[PDB]
Design a protein around this nucleic acid. Structure first.
Lengths: 98, 114, 151, 127, 79, 96
RNA sequence: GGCCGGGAACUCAAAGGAGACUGCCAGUGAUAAACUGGAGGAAGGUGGGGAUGACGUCAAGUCAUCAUGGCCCUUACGACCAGGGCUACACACGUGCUACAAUGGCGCAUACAAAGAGAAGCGACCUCGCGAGAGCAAGCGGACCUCAUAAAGUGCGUCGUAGUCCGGAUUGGAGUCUGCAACUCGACUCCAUGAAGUCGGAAUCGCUAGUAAUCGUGGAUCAGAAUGCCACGGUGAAUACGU
């Protein structure tokens, strides 16, 4: 319906983007349950630090994938207007699907 | 209790008794007793002579003892006579499947000497 | 252990009998960190001990272990370019610690069937002494008294 | 109203409930003897109920997941102590001495680079 | 043992085998490919297996059909 | 990093769409228990360098044939050189 | 059957906060720093672990990832292709796995995890085969669906001290899979064979608590080959008098 799901890399990026979408929706419309935090998948990589030998020292790498789910419960024609194209995208992949 | 092949076990299970003969192991051991209709946990003691020859007939089907030794030794000798990779590898006393001879050939090769 | 002195952390007691002495005992026998298989041997050994001897449960192994308590032990010096063994009185914490070890180590050298049985055999011969632990308890005893000089 | 307590022990999280009724143990819709707790850590679930006047005092419903046999048992151990809030923090004063309200900070150590599992440095050749 | 259904061979050597039947056998054929298995039609014919120096004159026989061409030429020189 | 073997990659990768991919639909349903005719396996005289797993997957910048990661598409050295200069979003010092 | 209303508590989940500072108290200490103990608290004396590695040393390693001074070859020390080698075998050492077993082997029944990966992918369920897998074929770009039925443990039975139901090597016959391609030179399965080995010489390696030890799982690499490597959890000790 309005089943939204995004993904951001930094510990706090979406928190302001998924904040502004709430008061855009709940002010003009109604309901709007709010941003569900969801589990963060963290893809951990480990590779050899030196070009030759030196396996005993390695630098560990990680990429955190932070999810959010808004889910506006009120699909009014007033609230769907003046909401889209206020995303001001900082990279984050917006997706609207079941 | 001659039991077809020259091996004669006693005072043990029927599953153990079978595996002691050459050319028979744990899988066939269960199959021969299951085919003949014998229990796993019953011993050679309390087993009639008319119950022996039924299991004797089952082991008599598959090639066992000296007949399997010559059959395997045919496939060793014949394969050596080909002059193949495996054939030269048998006669020279070295690993046939392609194991590493760099280190740990000690099973097929044999003990270290000067 | 040069600067830092530990607080000697206390293990929990035995879940059946409640004895904190047996909590260390099961842990000596425990190999591969298996407490469940360790105690199963311990109880099966202790049940066969008190049944055969006809004594009570707690004081069977305690009076048994009291016979295998070492009086004194020695410590290697290495000071003036030579090995000097100096005898010292083992304290009650270390006294039963070596006792439980040498019972389990003596039962480990046996060629008997089960661990419950072979351990119980050494517990059975603890009160009247023919076994290997009761030989092992006074090994340094002969080396001691000869080293009474160094004190 | 129900008398709730959480508790946990090495990634094993329990959810304890207490009431005034009968002393039948119910864990994950299963009995205490049918909760397989026969060997050491048999009665660590009732370790916080060792030194109390009980006979058959309270209903108890508990539910633990995560970790293993002993970790789930210590989650029930620490969980029941939080559920003692029916008697507020008056009975805690004696329970502080026992150290059951004390939550275990000991967690399994991470695997480290050039180490077999968290500590063991793999042996080196001679000198 | 391996290769599932059907014995795998190379195309160029299959033509060489059919050449030895149709046009008739003459000399040992020098082949670089060791991938192709021996067949019943190859019995009687002469081939030569390369292995890092020169093609070794290997003769085909009845029971050699089961094994590969490269088995009969050891690559690594010893002694 | 030896521009010839890097140029050999450009050949090897570019052949994968012509000879295989589209025409490698042959051998998939064809070499299967059906109905046999052995003329299908005689189509394997193709140049071979199009093979689906023939590339080593060298690093996109340098061309090292070792320490390649499928995620970043680069070698561990060029991962670290880049990683310390940022460039991978969400990448930092891993500790937990 | 949390499965369907519902319920938002709870666990779980990820955002922002509080909470641990020798401060409250006691003693010692030049009355300072600090130390020892106590109280409170989930956590007390840099809480636990990681990240975090000064000025410099060893002309230490890396001209082979890359970059680059100089030198050298340039119808060749370049370039392309096929096959071969890197996997050799009278030897020596290191680093590991698997054992020598009744704290155990085998067979049946049964309970309890965490961290991941997955669209040129992971594969239910279903049918076929003893099996490796094959054909048919949902859902899920993923707290949903798939890999995934974790093992120690535990309940019975059997084995009862032997080169054995220990142990699995080697070898034979016969299969599957990935791929143009499995002989050199594979993984894995089936049947059969069942070397050595029964705690190992001088000496030598690590570890102070959720550690040693032991028992499983996942990933990266990758078409396909882990006992390695990286990551995760289960159960879980011994002993620290002292320098």
């Amino acid at each position: 319906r309005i089943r939204i799901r995004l993904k951001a890399f930094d510990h706090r990026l979406i928190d302001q983007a998924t904040a502004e979408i709430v008061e855009t929706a709940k002010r003009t419309g109604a309901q709007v349950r709010g941003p569900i935090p969801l589990p963060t998948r963290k893809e951990r990589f480990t590779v050899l630090i030196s070009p030759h030998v030196n396996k005993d020292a390695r630098d560990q790498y990680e990429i955190r994938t932070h999810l959010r789910l808004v889910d506006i419960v009120e699909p009014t024609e007033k609230t769907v207007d003046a909401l889209m194209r206020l995303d001001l995208a900082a990279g984050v992949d917006v997706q609207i699907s079941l | 209790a001659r039991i077809a092949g020259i091996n004669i076990p006693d005072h043990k299970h029927a599953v153990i008794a079978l595996t002691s003969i050459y050319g028979v192991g744990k899988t066939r051991s269960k199959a021969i007793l299951a085919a003949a209709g014998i229990a796993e946990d019953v011993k050679i003691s309390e087993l009639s002579e008319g119950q022996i020859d039924t299991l004797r007939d089952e082991v008599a089907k598959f090639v066992v003892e000296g007949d399997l030794r010559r059959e395997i030794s045919m496939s060793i000798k014949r394969l050596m006579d080909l002059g193949c990779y495996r054939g030269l590898r048998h006669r020279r006393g070295l690993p046939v499947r392609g194991q590493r001879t760099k280190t740990n050939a000690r099973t097929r090769k044999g003990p270290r000497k000067p | 252990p040069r600067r830092r002195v530990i607080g000697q952390r206390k293990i929990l007691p035995d879940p059946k009998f409640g004895s904190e002495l047996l909590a260390k005992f099961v842990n000596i026998l425990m190999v591969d960190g298996k407490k469940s298989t360790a105690e199963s041997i311990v109880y099966s050994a202790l049940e066969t001990l008190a049944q055969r001897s006809g004594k009570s449960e707690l004081e069977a192994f305690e009076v048994a272990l009291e016979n295998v308590r070492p009086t004194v032990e020695v410590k290697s010096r290495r000071v003036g370019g030579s090995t000097y063994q100096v005898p010292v009185e083992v304290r009650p914490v270390r006294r039963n610690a070596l006792a439980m070890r040498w019972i389990v180590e003596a039962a480990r050298k046996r060629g008997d069937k089960s661990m419950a049985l072979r351990l119980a055999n050494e517990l059975s011969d603890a009160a009247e002494n023919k076994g290997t632990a009761v030989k092992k308890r006074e090994d340094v005893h002969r080396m001691a008294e000869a080293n009474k000089a160094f004190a | 109203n129900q008398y709730y307590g959480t508790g946990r022990r090495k990634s094993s999280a329990a959810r304890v409930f207490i009431k005034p009724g009968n002393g039948k143990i119910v864990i994950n819709q299963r009995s205490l003897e049918q909760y397989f707790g026969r060997e050491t850590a048999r009665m660590v679930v009732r370790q916080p109920l060792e030194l109390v006047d009980m006979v058959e005092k309270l209903d108890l419903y508990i539910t633990v997941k995560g970790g293993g046999i002993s970790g789930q048992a210590g989650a029930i151990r620490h969980g029941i102590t939080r559920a003692l809030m029916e008697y507020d923090e008056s009975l805690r004063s004696e329970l502080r001495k026992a150290g059951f309200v004390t939550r275990d900070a000991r967690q399994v150590e991470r695997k480290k680079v050039g180490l077999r599992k968290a500590r063991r440095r793999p042996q080196f050749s001679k000198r | 043992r391996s290769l599932k259904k059907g014995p795998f061979i190379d195309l160029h050597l299959l033509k060489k085998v059919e050449k030895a039947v149709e046009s008739g056998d003459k000399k040992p054929l020098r082949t670089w490919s060791r991938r192709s298995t021996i067949f019943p039609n190859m019995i009687g014919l002469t081939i030569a297996v390369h292995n890092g120096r020169q093609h070794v004159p290997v003769f085909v026989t009845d029971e050699m059909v089961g094994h590969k061409l490269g088995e009969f030429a050891p690559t690594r020189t010893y002694r | 990093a030896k521009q010839s073997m890097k140029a050999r990659e450009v050949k090897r990768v570019a052949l994968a769409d012509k000879y295989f991919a589209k025409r490698a639909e042959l051998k998939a349903i064809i070499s299967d228990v059906n109905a046999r005719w052995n003329a299908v396996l005689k189509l394997q005289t193709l140049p071979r360098d199009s093979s689906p797993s023939r590339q080593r997957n060298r690093c996109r910048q340098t061309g090292r044939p070792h320490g390649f990661l499928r995620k970043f598409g680069l070698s561990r050295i060029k991962v670290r050189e880049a990683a310390m200069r940022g460039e991978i979003p969400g990448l930092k010092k891993a500790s937990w």
